[PDB]
Structure formats: C-alpha cells, structure tokens
Symmetry: C3
C-alpha cells in the first residue's frame, strides 16, 4: 500500500478513548490509543518490542501501559519504564515507537511518519467543533473501501441528489451553480442551489417551512483527506453568511489499502439546545453516511479487480472538476513521499 | 481466470428478472440484468462508466436504468441516454457495455465473450421448456465449487456419441425398473440419456414405457441441468424438468422444484465443495485424477472444454 | 510454507478416533484418520484418487474406508480393495497414500515426510500418559498461529505471571531462578520457586514450587509443575507432568494437544475438574488470545524488518527456536 505518512490523520474521536486502550490500525500501522491518568492521549505502536504482543490488550499500571504477555511497562513516549525480569535492565531496545498526537478541535490527530517532522501548524482547521456558538454531534464509521473513493464521494456532493434522494433531492438541481477555488494545499468546491423548494433535510433545518429557498452545499478539502462542508439554507436572496447552516466534519483515514475510517460530524448554528434536531442530524448521519454512501463505495471497491484487469478508466462529467483536482493532488503527494 | 468466454451461458431464469435489476456475476463479469417496460431483457456490465457504481442498485426512469450514484441513464443497448450534469452532453465514452442476450426456451442466455462471434443460432435447443405438451418447473442454486465438478457429476445398452460441441451419453435398460416418480403412471424398458452442449449446458431424458414403445411416446422427463461459472471456484446451477406425466399435479411440481431433490443433495454439495478445497494441494503436488469405467462421457466432455480453453489462450 | 516434514507429529488423541473417520490437516497435508476393527489406526491422504473427494467423510465397510462419492474402498495401507464400477478392476492408480502411524503413550503419531526415513525409535517419550501411577486428563485445541509462537509461549513459562495472573500469580517472581540444560535434540528449562506463597492453582493442590519444561524436536513438550512444603525434596513433591504438543496445520495455524498426568488425587474427580478448568481457561482461551494476536502482527513486523528484543527469561525459548529454524532450513536446502 502507498500512503502519505508525513501528514496528520485523525485516529479517533476523543470520546472513543479512555484508560482502556483502543487498538486501531491507520495506514497499515497498528496503534494502541489511550488517555493517561493525567488526561494526555498517547499513541504507541501496538507491537511490544519484546515478542510483539498487542499492548492494546494490556491495562494501565501506574499510568503506564503494561504489556499483557510478560509485563513490560511503557510511558506515553514509548519509553520502557519497568522490566520485571532478572536484573530489571531497560536498554533502548525495549522502547516502543510512539506517535506524535495533537488533541485539537475535538479530534485526535496523529502523525504516522517521521516524528521529527510533525508540525502542529499543518493540522487542518476544524475550530467550529469546539466553538460554543456551534452545536456539534457525530461519530465514527468503518468502511471497506479505499479512502480515495470517499474523498471522491465528498468532493462531488451532487451525489446527494441520487444516493440520498429521499432526504436531499431538490427540484432546483438543474440550476446548480458550481465553482472550484484552488489554493495552496486546499481546494474548495462551491455549490449553490437557487430558488428551489427546500429538500426534506433542509425543510427539517427550517422546521417545516416549505416556501422557496436558496441553499448551499460547499466543501473544503485539505491534504491529505480532511474535508469540511457547508450545508446551508435561507430565504431567497438572503446572503450565505446570514444562513442557518451545518459545517460538516468529513474526515477519512486509511486503514488498509482497501479499507478506511470515517469520522463525521455536524456543527450547526441553529437549534443549538434542541435534542430533537440532534436526532435529525444523527439519523441523517446514520442513513446517509454509514449506510447509503458506504453501500456505494463498498460496491465500487468490489469492482476494482475487474476495472483494473480490463484497463477501464473513469469517464469524467462536468461535476468532477474538484474531485479530479483533489485526486491528482493526493497522487502527487503519494509520489513525492515514495521518493523519500 | 481460465474460462471459455466464447459461448452462450444461462445467466438467469426469466422469473428472476423484472424492472428491478438483478446483479449477478458470470465468468468473473458482473452483470445487471433487467426487463424493460416492453418486456425485453437487457444485460449491462454492472459498472457505471462514470465512477463504476453498480447499475444493478439503480431503478428504471422511463424504461431506462439510472445509475444510483450520479444519475446517468442507459438504454438496453448500453447507450447513455441522459446526463443530468452541466450541458448534458453524452459522448460515446459514457456508454456502458451491453451483452448479447437472448430469452429463449424460458432461459436467459448471455454471451460473455467476443461479441462478434455471438450467433444466436448456436444457442442450445431446450425447446421442451416452452412446449405446451410438457409441464416445466425448476429453480436456481449456487455452489462453492468450480463448475467442471458439477459437469463431471452430471455426465456420470450404453453408448457415448461425440460431436462438435455436443456429446450424448445414452443408456437403455430393457426389463428395467420405473423410477419411484414414474412408477405409478404405468414389463418395461427404461432410458437414461444425457446430452451436453458446450460449455456446460445439459438436458437429460429419463423415461419408462412398456417394452416395444418408441422412447418418444414413453412416460418421461427432460431435465434441464445448466451450469454457469461465477468465479473460478463457484458456480450457478439452473435446474428444471419438463415432464409429460402428472402435468396438473402441484405436489409433483413441488418436489421437482427442490434443489436437493433435483439438482444437488446436501451430502453431494458437501463433497464437491470439499473437492474444491483440495484443489491447491492437488495442483501443488502434480496429482491427476484416476478415471474409472463410469467416467467415459465426463472425460470426453472435459477434453472438449480444455480444447476450447486452449483456443482462447492467445 | 517451511515445515520440518521428516519428523513425527501428533495428529490426534486416541479418543478422537473411531470407525468414523476424522479429517485433519497436518503440515498442509489433509489426512483421514480412523481406527480399524482390529484396533489399528490408519492415516490416509484425505483425497480420493478418483475425483479427489474427502475420504474422511465416508464410513467403514468391512473395516475398509469407503469414499462417500462413488464408493471406492481402501485398506489401511491405502490399497484400493473395491471398485463397484464396471468390471470392478483395481489398477494401481487407484491406490491412495498411507502415512506411517504409531500409537504410543496415548498419542497418535504420524510421519508426514519421506516414508523411507520414518523410524519409530525417534518418537519422544511421554510414558506418564499410560503409567497406572498417574491420572491423565486433557484434550485438543485449534489455534490460529504459527506453531513456533506456541512453542515460544510454552518455553517461557514466566508469562503465566501476567497472561495467567488470576491463576498463576506468585510474589516470589522477584526471586525466580531458572536453569537451562541443553541436550541432543532436547532442551530443558528448570526452575525452583522457593519459600513462596502458592499460586491459586498450587493451593488447589510457605511452599516450594517447581515448573520445569522439556522440549524435544520438533515441537513436543512435557512440563513438570510441582509443589511441596518449604524444604521438601523436588522428587517427593506432588506433581503434574503436562503434555504440551504442537503440530503445524498451515503456516499460520496449529493443533495443540494438552494433558495433565498427575501423581496425586488420582481417584479424585474434583481434581480432574480443577485441571480441566485450568486447561480451558489458560491454554485454550488466554494463551490462544495472545499468540493469535501476535500472528496478526506478523505482516507488519516482517514488512518493517522488526526483530524481537530478548529479556533474561528468554534463553530456553531462543535456543529451541534456533534449533527448529535450523531443522527447517536444513530440510528446505535439500
Ligand atoms: S511480548 Fe510484551 S513483555 Fe513480552
Ligand atoms: S458512477 Fe454512475 S453516474 Fe456517477
Ligand atoms: S471421488 Fe472417490 S470414488 Fe469417486
Ligand atoms: Fe453522501
Ligand atoms: Fe500459558
């Protein structure tokens, strides 16, 4: 598998983690992820340097992760801090690899490449997730596809018109206005849907109001595979910036070449103290993201062998510009990294 | 990934198909099989030309299959007939592969190979299946073995008659014994014949009459036994019978629709699936099967298949 | 992948075998194992020479294994003895491979390698299993690891302080002493565990305990777990001699034959229960979970050239591992 290792990836949502380790593989690298007694998250290679047992099946002893096999103890920097055996000697050979972690924007970011190069300034901005003006709900999904298929999915949100038609179909789809803005390490795909009846989802945002609206569904990509969308709806002619909206976290992290982790969320500026609106967004996430999109991209992954064996290449449509530009940027990053 | 692609295979029974597409893989080729509003069956490659979504997860829009991902619509010839996006242009690059398909003898026949060579006149004759003189019932099953194993099993006064892409194994038993099924409709002759056509389509003839009687006027069933490879190690099995006895008996219909009664009893499925699991060992150790006297027809068939494979190798 | 094929392996416990065949794969070789009416065990390649059906799914007819598919019948030497078809001729091509088998010490040993070379004198000694002075209970487990991982597990029995902490803990761990003695195709790790409080298990039979293990090539081990009052001679201890015998199934899976042969409470059903409970919990659950997890990490370890870092407890396991690697490479280079 080719992955871009010198980049930050979301490995977990903070609420997934505790003093009980979580074993999760990112970029074909098995990790043991836990929150220490002092609250700091650690990420260790989930392979004990002694005989390769899963540290993730161990427990904390004195805030130190104890290997379940012969009881070596490790701190969050991977240092072996206790060896129960013989003279108890702890040479550097017993230290386990530790991965840089930044807990930011209610995300656990990990750097899986050269730890010397881990630069917190490179972490994409998802500040809305911790902004008290936004209400955020979301979760985790596992998907049996190459993460690039879900990047493709997200970078053409037009797919919602079909894949999510029961919730997302608009009668103004024929009048979509698209632009693509290309920045440095960042690409935006903008979509405005002018003058339509609100979709079923947008009508729920508005609490049933069914008169004509403008809607937007923009998305921002940052390398490698972190996206933030803007789903918004307002009375015709009222500015974007004044709209009720959800900024959607859509972040992918490769697991294996043919599987990935999907971290999703909605950060909304409306109905902030409304458990029933929470439910609308959670049920949307459960149906759209973890069911419908999964089913499409997992089917596409199953067709990979045929496509490759037969030299089949995708045929592009007018809606693909942003997805293609992103795909080419990822490929470029992949090749740059394969040189190092 | 060794198949004989240049041949007609059954992909479905007609009763499986409707305006809701069926996704089924034959010879490692995923198909979307559906009936258009005019009744006519279409068979498209189950891979959208845009981004490779399963067209079989789509629905018809004005009789045209719509990709479930971004809404490209296709006709039964695979032509893209609507592009929702932008200027709506439909360059030839948006067309999807369509397979030669013939509905005949209550079977859906598909040609997975070189479409230039697909001659509908070469489709095997299963006419009994739509002959009103016969009551025809049957069904479908899936098996986790190479189809050749089931062909071998099927093909096991004798005579074996060998022709070009057809082989017949005939057996007559004078003073023979009615099958349990037929006994009650009767000093008998019995017949058990089977006909193979390339690659894996068989029709048997199981019959009993008073001695003397033209086997053509016997009490008899003609059994449909048609295999289609799914992967190298799995197959589809279409079975059925066309009978001239008890034609209005629904209980008889029932037992003749049973997979285990008519096609493959569980104990034999266990055996053939186990044989498939021994393939790796057999190949690694250069082990070849040892044939018995009962294998004569199966061997002849096996050799013809291998020749057809070898042709396609280049 | 690479196995030591020229060696005896346990393929079954005798109690697993009957006139109903058992299909089991050893060293990537599928076998049909059964007991003939005269009591003699046969082991045939589980691939009918006709069309490759599992003979192990058939039954015996007049003491002969009958293929379930078209009913060829075979004797214990693999000779085809009946062909129900045609003239019933039995050409030599119908015979099936039969493997050398020795039933000894309440074990079924099979030689999967060059049959010219199978010397029954080479089978290691597990005589306690049929010694009237000992009571033996045990069984079979399947494990999704390469057998060498479970050899490691068994040869460093100081994982029991952690993996088996609920049953096997003892404070005296601080003060382990462990002696490795190397012999010819045989390695032992010995151990006094002195003056200590007994582990939960020991209590179920201040104490001295011992926990020795003997390995013989390829992967056959017998341990010695013993406790006695402080100051008591190792040899007057109540003890269990543990059968711990591994046989490769595939590159990444194995068969585990375990047993306890004890010299105490030998008429006592409650003790049977303590031992069978330990075997169930320790060997088939806890150790299984660890080694199966390590197996899953193999791809990463190999891809990244990672080598193990050894501790003071590892000598015996390392010596054994070196001997197996040596046998494995000695064979593949011929
Ligand atoms: S494998 Fe971790 S201490 Fe031995
Ligand atoms: S994958 Fe079919 S329209 Fe996009
Ligand atoms: S496969 Fe055993 S008798 Fe035919
Ligand atoms: Fe979606
Ligand atoms: Fe253990």
């Amino acid at each position: 598998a080719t992955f871009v290792r010198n980049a930050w990836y979301v490995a977990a949502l903070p609420e997934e983690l505790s003093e009980k380790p979580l074993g999760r593989t990112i970029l074909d690298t098995p990790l043991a992820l836990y929150r220490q007694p002092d609250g700091v998250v650690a990420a260790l290679l989930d392979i004990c340097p002694h005989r390769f047992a899963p540290l993730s099946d161990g427990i904390l002893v004195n805030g130190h992760l104890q290997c379940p096999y012969h009881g070596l103890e490790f701190d969050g920097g991977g240092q072996c801090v206790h060896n129960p055996h013989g003279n108890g000697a702890r040479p550097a050979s017993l230290n386990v690899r530790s991965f840089p972690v930044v807990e930011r924007d209610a995300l656990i970011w990990i750097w899986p490449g050269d730890p010397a190069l881990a630069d917190p300034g490179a972490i994409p901005d998802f500040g809305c997730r911790v902004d008290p003006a936004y209400r955020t709900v979301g979760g985790y999904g596992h998907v049996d596809c190459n993460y690039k298929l879900l990047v493709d999915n997200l970078m053409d949100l037009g797919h919602a018109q079909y894949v999510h038609r029961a919730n997302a179909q608009t009668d103004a789809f024929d009048r979509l206005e698209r632009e693509v803005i290309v920045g440095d390490g960042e690409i935006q795909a903008l979509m405005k849907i002018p003058g339509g009846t609100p979709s079923v989802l947008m009508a729920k945002f508005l609490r049933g109001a069914n008169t004509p609206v403008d809607a937007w569904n923009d998305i921002r990509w940052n390398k490698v595979s972190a996206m933030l969308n803007f789903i918004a709806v307002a009375p015709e002619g009222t500015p974007k910036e004044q709209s009720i909206h959800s900024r959607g976290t859509h972040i992918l992290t490769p697991e294996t070449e043919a599987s990935c982790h999907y971290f999703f969320g909605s950060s909304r500026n409306f109905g902030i103290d409304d458990p029933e609106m929470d439910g609308v967004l959670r049920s949307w996430q459960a149906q759209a993201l973890v069911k419908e999109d999964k089913v499409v991209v997992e089917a596409i992954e199953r067709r990979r062998a045929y496509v490759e064996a037969n030299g089949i290449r995708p045929a592009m449509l007018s809606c693909d510009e942003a997805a293609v530009r992103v795909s080419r940027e990822i490929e470029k990053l992949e090749q740059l990294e394969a040189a190092r």
